[PDB]
Amino acid sequence: CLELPTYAAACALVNSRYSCLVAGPHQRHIALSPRYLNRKRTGIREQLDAELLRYSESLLGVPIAYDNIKVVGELGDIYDDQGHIHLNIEADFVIFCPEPGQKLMGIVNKVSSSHIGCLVHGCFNASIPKPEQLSAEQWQTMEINMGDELEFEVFRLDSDAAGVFCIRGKLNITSL
């Protein structure tokens, strides 16, 4: 339901046997607003929350949680004519780095003729195409784990139009 997860000691360790929630400390670059000269932690947390659920090729994945916000150096680099102060951050992330053809699990929204949207970790509205041209009788007579929970494969990943790393992967039953 797009509910914001806490860091929750690495998101209650949702780096399970299948879903790749690898955790590693990283450095990011932050253009802090000048209204946050005091309350720098608030502005850093706000810009990191703006960074969440968006794919970063530098982080090689999609961040879902951050902790240990540490500032590198006590000097903030005000550049020439701009107002934003640029400070270099150090934080420990929990990121989501998927692959083509690998295993994931999801909690479904709908199962239509050709749209199955399964929530991966409660944030990622990952859509699944239901028919894979093997039969049209597999639409009825469920047999595709049509429950609250579902496990699936990914063939391609393309970001959504507004603030979401979308995942477009077919169901890929192991038999048939």
Binding site: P34, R35, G83
Partner: protein, 79 residues
Amino acid sequence: QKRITTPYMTKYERARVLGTRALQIAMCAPVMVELEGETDPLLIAMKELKARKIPIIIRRYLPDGSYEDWGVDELIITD
């Protein structure tokens, strides 16, 4: 090391200190002084310079590449 440059703020430094600080007060940076009805960020930045309440560090680069750091609190401002 010992800072071996001028204890006075030069005229080129107070222009850029007032420019940077008025650009900060142009955003919603908190004002360290009491606004007596000013609406110009330059006048507020001049009151903050006069009250020694600007925290910015001037990094005076020497022509080899070396520098030394001065706050505006530890520079001698004049008229």
